[PDB]
């Protein structure tokens, strides 16, 4: 819920979506 | 199972020869038995001595003169100037808020090959009849003060065979020479040398060491 760890969670699942999409 | 204080001889610590008290204290050494002479262990022993105790007066209480045991001549253990320093809580009492500290440091030589680093501290005095609550000096005034101090500390050197410097540090005369050489710029209270180091020494010269007796 902390607007930092919220942001980090979004920024992690974005990076893991980049690595999924590079395939 | 030893208690080696049985085999520990006391030796005669003399402080030649400019200071009034030519006798300071007694340092114990492991007894000079097989293959290890006392000299080897008692050479280079830096004994700090408070200049209050070394000259009796309480006006010399904010000063420590390091003395290294250097010579022996038929069991005669005499020291020589190794360094002067201020007391850790007079230095700190002179530092105060609403002032300006000035630190001059010069890596000078002497007449003899003694590479001495002389420091010096000088604080700004709020002059009598002042309603302004601080005595802050300008950067230009401090640059000008450091210059004045630096060339005085170097003028009182090339003379000053470290012996003559010792005999001119004790009577507070560099302090009251810099006072009048800076008063033309800023009041400047508490001018002291504060510290002297021996960064490097010449070759021994036991004549130069022993001329400090009799």
């Amino acid at each position: 819920m902390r607007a930092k760890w919220r942001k980090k969670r979004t920024r992690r699942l974005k990076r893991k979506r980049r690595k999924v999409r590079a395939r | 199972v030893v208690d080696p204080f049985t085999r520990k001889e006391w030796f005669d610590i003399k402080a030649p020869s400019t200071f009034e008290n030519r006798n300071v204290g007694k340092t114990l050494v492991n007894k000079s038995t097989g293959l290890k002479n006392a000299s080897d262990a008692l050479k280079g022993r830096v004994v700090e001595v408070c200049l209050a105790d070394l000259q009796g007066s309480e006006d010399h209480s904010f000063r420590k003169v390091k003395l290294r045991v250097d010579e022996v001549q038929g069991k005669n253990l005499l020291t020589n100037f190794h360094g002067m320093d201020f007391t850790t809580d007079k230095l700190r009492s002179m530092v105060r808020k609403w002032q300006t500290l000035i630190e001059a440091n010069v890596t000078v030589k002497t007449s003899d090959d003694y590479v001495l680093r002389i420091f010096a501290i000088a604080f700004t005095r709020k002059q009598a009849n002042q309603v302004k609550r601080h005595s802050y000096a300008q950067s230009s005034h401090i640059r000008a003060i450091r210059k004045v101090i630096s060339e005085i500390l170097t003028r009182e050197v090339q003379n000053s065979t470290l012996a003559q410097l010792t005999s001119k540090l004790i009577p507070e005369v560099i302090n009251k020479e810099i006072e009048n050489a800076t008063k033309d710029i800023f009041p400047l209270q508490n001018i002291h040398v504060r510290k002297v180091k021996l960064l490097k020494q010449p070759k021994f010269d036991v004549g130069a060491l022993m001329a400090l007796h009799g």
Binding site: - | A52, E58, S61, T87, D89, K90, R92, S93, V95
Partner: protein, 97 residues
């Protein structure tokens, strides 16, 4: 809301003050913000000095003091130092002890 006209701080005319470590917490805090207080004390406590002097050499016993500026962070200070969190009235009173 904004609690202080300052910021529990001084920084006005400056961009960034070089920080200072809290004496007990070790927490780094900007110098201007850090609660500074000079701890000036006699080397020997105010109970021992009788037996100190009577058993000391050198009569007149100079008795040198000790000086060290304690820098405290805000939380370490709130532990019953001179802070005693005061009313929104008495917050503004700058006058020391």
């Amino acid at each position: 809301p904004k609690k202080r006209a300052s910021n529990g701080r001084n920084k006005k005319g400056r961009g960034h003050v070089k920080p200072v470590r809290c004496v007990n917490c070790s927490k780094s805090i900007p110098k201007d913000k850090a609660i500074k207080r000079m701890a000036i004390r006699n080397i020997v406590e105010a109970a021992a000095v009788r037996d100190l002097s009577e058993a000391s050499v050198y009569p007149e016993y100079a008795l040198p003091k000790t000086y060290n500026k304690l820098h405290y962070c805000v939380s370490c200070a709130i532990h019953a130092r001179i802070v005693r969190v005061r009313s929104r009235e008495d917050r503004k009173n700058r006058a020391p002890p």
